[PDB]
C-alpha cells in the first residue's frame, strides 16, 4: 500500500472575535504530523452574543468540524516515509436554534 | 520532492439549516482527486437571521474557510499532494 507521492504543498480574519458565535484558537501540535500545527476553534460561549452584546443561552455556539487528511511519519524509525490518516478538526463556530 | 506514503487511511447534523448564518452545500467533483467529492458551502443570505426569524443587514453571513490537503492522480506521462482552500460553513459577524 506504499505509493510514491510528489510534494507540491509549497506556497488575517478576525471572524473569531467578531462572530455572534466567537471562538478562541487552540494549538494542535503533533511533531510527527504534516501539518505539524493545526489551529482548532474552541467556542468561547455555550450560547451566542445578542445585539445588546450579551450571551443569549437559548441560542447555541456550535463548532463546524471537517474531516481532513494528514501525513504521519511511519514507520517512526524511517524518514522520507509516511502514512495517510484522517483527523476531525474544528474550523470555527456558528450560531444555531435548539430542537 | 517525492515521499513514500501508505495510502491505507487511518481514522450527520443540520447546522447548515439551523444557523443565523445558514448555508447550502454545492457539489465539487473531480474524478482525479481524493477526495473525489468535496461539499463546499455558500452563505444563503448576505445578512443574518435575527431573534424573530427575519434578516438583519447589519449582521453578516461570512464563510469559514480552511486549507485542506488533497491527492491528484499524476498523469500517465502516481499521485501529487496539493493544498486547496474550501468553505466548510458560514458564521455571523459584525463590522
Amino acid at each position, epitope marked *: 500500500r506504499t505509493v510514491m507521492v510528489n510534494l507540491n504543498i509549497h506556497n488575517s480574519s478576525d471572524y473569531y472575535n467578531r462572530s455572534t458565535s466567537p471562538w478562541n484558537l487552540h494549538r494542535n501540535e503533533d511533531p510527527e504530523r504534516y501539518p505539524s500545527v493545526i489551529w482548532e476553534a474552541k467556542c468561547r460561549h455555550l450560547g451566542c452574543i445578542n445585539a445588546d452584546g450579551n450571551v443569549d443561552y437559548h441560542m447555541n455556539s456550535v463548532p463546524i468540524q471537517q474531516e481532513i487528511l494528514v501525513l504521519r511519519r511511519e514507520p517512526p524509525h524511517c524518514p522520507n516515509s509516511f502514512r495517510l490518516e484522517k483527523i476531525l478538526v474544528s474550523v470555527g463556530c456558528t450560531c444555531v436554534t435548539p430542537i | 520532492r517525492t515521499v513514500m506514503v501508505n495510502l491505507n487511511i487511518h481514522n450527520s447534523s443540520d447546522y447548515y439549516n439551523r444557523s443565523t448564518s445558514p448555508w447550502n452545500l454545492h457539489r465539487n467533483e473531480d*474524478p482525479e482527486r481524493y477526495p473525489s467529492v468535496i461539499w463546499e458551502a455558500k452563505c444563503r443570505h448576505l445578512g443574518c437571521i435575527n431573534a424573530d426569524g427575519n434578516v438583519d443587514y447589519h449582521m453578516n453571513s461570512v464563510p469559514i474557510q480552511q486549507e485542506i490537503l488533497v491527492l491528484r*492522480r499524476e498523469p500517465p506521462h502516481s499521485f501529487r499532494l496539493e493544498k486547496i482552500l474550501v468553505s466548510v460553513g458560514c458564521t455571523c459577524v459584525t463590522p
Partner: antibody, heavy 117, light 113 residues
Framework: QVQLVQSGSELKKPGASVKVSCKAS????????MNWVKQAPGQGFEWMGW????????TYAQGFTGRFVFSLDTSVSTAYLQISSLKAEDTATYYC??????????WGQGTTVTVSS | DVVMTQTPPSLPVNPGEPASISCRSS???????????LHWYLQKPGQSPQLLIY???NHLSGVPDRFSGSGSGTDFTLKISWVEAEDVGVYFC?????????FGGGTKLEIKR
C-alpha cells in the same frame, strides 16, 4: 494485478432474496468505490450504482432504488449485492467492477442469478 | 441518461487485418475538469471483462500500441491493427463523465474465414 473474485451461481424462487459477494485479492486505493453492473440475458450492461470503499456510503442508479442494497466488509476485502422480492427481470449476470480516478480498472467474472418457480 | 450508440454489433476480421469500432454519445463527454471519461473494455470468451484504453487514448501497462483510442466530444473510435486470435471477444465503451455511467451495446470480434 488485483483480482476481484465474485461469489457463485444462484438459483432463487420469485419473492426471494439473494446476496452476491465480490472479494478483492488485495486493498484498492480509490477516490470512488466498487460499482455494480446488471446484464440481462442477450442484453447490454446496465449500471446499478456504487458504494464508497472509504465511507461505506452507497449511491443507487434510478433503476435500482428499492430492493437493492450494496454493502461492504473491509476485514475480508469483500463487497455484497443484495436483491429482494426477486422477479423475472432480475434473472441476469451481475458484475462487480472497481472504479477509481475516472474509470473501471478491474471487473469480477460475474455471478449468474436465475429466478425460477 | 447519456446513450452510447456503439457499432457495429458484430465485426468479422481477417487475422493480421485491422478492426475499427465506433462509440457515439447523446451529448459531450467533456467533464467540467477538462478530461473526457470515455473508456474501452474487452470481455474475452469465458473471462472477466478487462480494461484496454481509459480517458479516450490512455493505455493500461500491458495493452500494446496496436490498440488505439481516438475521438472528441460525442464521437469516439477504438482501432485494433494486427487482429490476432487472442483478440476474439466483446469490445464495449463506457462513459463515466455523466451519472448514471452508461455503456455501448458491445461489438463481437470474430475471426473471418
Amino acid at each position: 494485478q488485483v483480482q476481484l473474485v465474485q461469489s457463485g451461481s444462484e438459483l432463487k424462487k420469485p419473492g426471494a432474496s439473494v446476496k452476491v459477494s465480490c472479494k478483492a485479492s488485495e486493498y484498492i486505493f480509490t477516490n470512488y468505490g466498487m460499482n455494480w453492473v446488471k446484464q440481462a440475458p442477450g442484453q447490454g450492461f446496465e449500471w446499478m450504482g456504487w458504494i464508497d470503499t472509504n465511507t461505506g456510503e452507497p449511491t443507487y442508479a434510478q433503476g435500482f432504488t428499492g430492493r437493492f442494497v450494496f454493502s461492504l466488509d473491509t476485514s475480508v476485502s469483500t463487497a455484497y449485492l443484495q436483491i429482494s422480492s426477486l422477479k423475472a427481470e432480475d434473472t441476469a449476470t451481475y458484475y462487480c467492477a472497481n472504479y477509481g480516478w475516472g474509470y473501471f480498472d478491474y471487473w469480477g467474472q460475474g455471478t449468474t442469478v436465475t429466478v425460477s418457480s | 441518461d447519456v446513450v452510447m450508440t456503439q457499432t457495429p454489433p458484430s465485426l468479422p476480421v481477417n487475422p493480421g487485418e485491422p478492426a475499427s469500432i465506433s462509440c457515439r454519445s447523446s451529448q459531450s463527454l467533456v467533464h467540467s475538469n477538462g478530461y473526457t471519461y470515455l473508456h474501452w473494455y474487452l470481455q474475452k470468451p469465458g473471462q472477466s471483462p478487462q480494461l484496454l484504453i481509459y480517458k479516450v487514448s490512455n493505455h493500461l501497462s500491458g495493452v500494446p500500441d496496436r490498440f488505439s483510442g481516438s475521438g472528441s466530444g460525442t464521437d469516439f473510435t477504438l482501432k485494433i491493427s494486427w487482429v490476432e486470435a487472442e483478440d476474439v471477444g466483446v469490445y464495449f465503451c463506457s462513459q463515466s463523465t455523466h451519472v448514471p455511467y452508461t455503456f455501448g451495446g458491445g461489438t463481437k470480434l470474430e475471426i473471418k474465414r
